[PDB]
Amino acid sequence: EIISSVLEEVKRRLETMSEDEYFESVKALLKEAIKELNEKKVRVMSNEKTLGLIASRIEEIKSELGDVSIELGETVDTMGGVIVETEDGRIRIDNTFEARMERFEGEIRSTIAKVLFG
Amino acid sequence: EIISSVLEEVKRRLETMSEDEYFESVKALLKEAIKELNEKKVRVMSNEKTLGLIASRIEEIKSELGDVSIELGETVDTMGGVIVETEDGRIRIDNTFEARMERFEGEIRSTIAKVLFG
Numbered sequence: 507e508i509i510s511s512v513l514e515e516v517k518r519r520l521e522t523m524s525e526d527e528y529f530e531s532v533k534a535l536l537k538e539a540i541k542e543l544n545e546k547k548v549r550v551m552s553n554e555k556t557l558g559l560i561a562s563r564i565e566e567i568k569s570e571l572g573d574v575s576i577e578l579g580e581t582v583d584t585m586g587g588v589i590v591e592t593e594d595g596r597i598r599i600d601n602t603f604e605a606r607m608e609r610f611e612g613e614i615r616s617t618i619a620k621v622l623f624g
Numbered sequence: 625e626i627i628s629s630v631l632e633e634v635k636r637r638l639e640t641m642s643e644d645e646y647f648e649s650v651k652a653l654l655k656e657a658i659k660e661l662n663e664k665k666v667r668v669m670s671n672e673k674t675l676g677l678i679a680s681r682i683e684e685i686k687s688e689l690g691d692v693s694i695e696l697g698e699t700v701d702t703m704g705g706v707i708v709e710t711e712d713g714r715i716r717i718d719n720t721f722e723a724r725m726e727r728f729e730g731e732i733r734s735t736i737a738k739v740l741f742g
Contacts, residue, residue, distance in 0.1 A: 507636070511629035516736055518625070534742040586740075606739045613738070617731040618634055621724045622704075624652040 508614060513607050517585055529559055529566075532588065535606075536560070537571050539590035539599040551579040551589040552602070560588075626732060631725050635703055647677055647684075650706065653724075654678070655689050657708035657717040669697040669707040670720070678706075 520528070540548055550560060557578050560567065564576065582589065584602040591598035638646070658666055668678060675696050678685065682694065700707065702720040709716035 508630065508633040511632065512626065512732070512736065514629065515626040515732075516739060519736070519740075531740045538742055603739055610735050610739055613735040614630070614633075614732065617728050617735070618630065618637070620731070621634060621721055621728055622637075622649045624656055 509607050509611055512614060513585065513604065516603055516607065520586060525559070528586070529563060531586065532556060532559055533567060533570055535587050535601040536567065536576075536590065539588065539601045540571065540574055542599055543590065543592055543597055545592050546573060547575045547577070547593040548590050549577045549579040549593055549595070551582050551591075552587065553584050554581050556586060556588065557581060627725050627729055630732060631703065631722065634721055634725065638704060643677070646704070647681060649704065650674060650677055651685060651688055653705050653719040654685065654694075654708065657706065657719045658689065658692055660717055661708065661710055661715055663710050664691060665693045665695070665711040666708050667695045667697040667711055667713070669700050669709075670705065671702050672699050674704060674706065675699060 536550065550557065552560075560576065561578060567576065568574065577593065579589075579591075582602075584604060587602035587604075587606060589598060589600050589602060654668065668675065670678075678694065679696060685694065686692065695711065697707075697709075700720075702722060705720035705722075705724060707716060707718050707720060
């Protein structure tokens with residue numbers, strides 16, 4: 507439940523976020539996933555808006571990310587972020603805000619521990 | 625609002641917390657506030673349950689905390705933690721879970737930033 511509540515704060519911040527700021531998130535999460543897969547050709551999935559951004563700014567993405575090839579995949583219901591997989595679909599990395607918040611849960615718990623026990 | 629939602633997680637954890645674990649929180653927050661005030665005689669305020677614990681385990685508190693004198697003050701509506709002030713009331717330190725969560729907000733924001741931008 508704490509994961510859900512923190513994601514509501516994320517969704518509040520996304521409510522006024524400019525496209526340029528959101529794109530910085532897109533590039534960072536894309537790059538991280540692509541580095542991990544260590545492949546030049548990948549398929550990306552996210553919500554409609556995000557895939558539209560990636561398509562619109564592919565030049566900017568290739569400049570900052572190096573020599574990688576991206577193919578849009580199916581749209582998925584997500585608040586943001588990206589799911590990146592090898593072209594053959596064998597390996598998939600989930601970098602959606604929902605999955606990332608779950609993985610960062612430990613950090614929220616460290617904060618709570620500090621509040622309680624210092 | 626994010627502060628309120630994280631405090632709901634704190635309140636969930638307090639729902640099953642044993643007296644001994646809660647007392648570790650009490651001692652830690654009391655000690656921190658007393659060190660800051662750097663005074664031997666202080667007055668403490670918290671909810672009824674907490675003041676009752678402090679009263680019941682004053683020996684344990686004095687052993688782990690050194691030579692300090694504590695006087696119970698008025699009960700305040702709080703989830704837990706303590707408010708400690710000099711006997712003359714001139715200086716007061718707010719170490720209630722509510723105040724501490726507010727002060728740790730920045731930590732929750734660092735986590736959110738990581739989720740969004742890595």
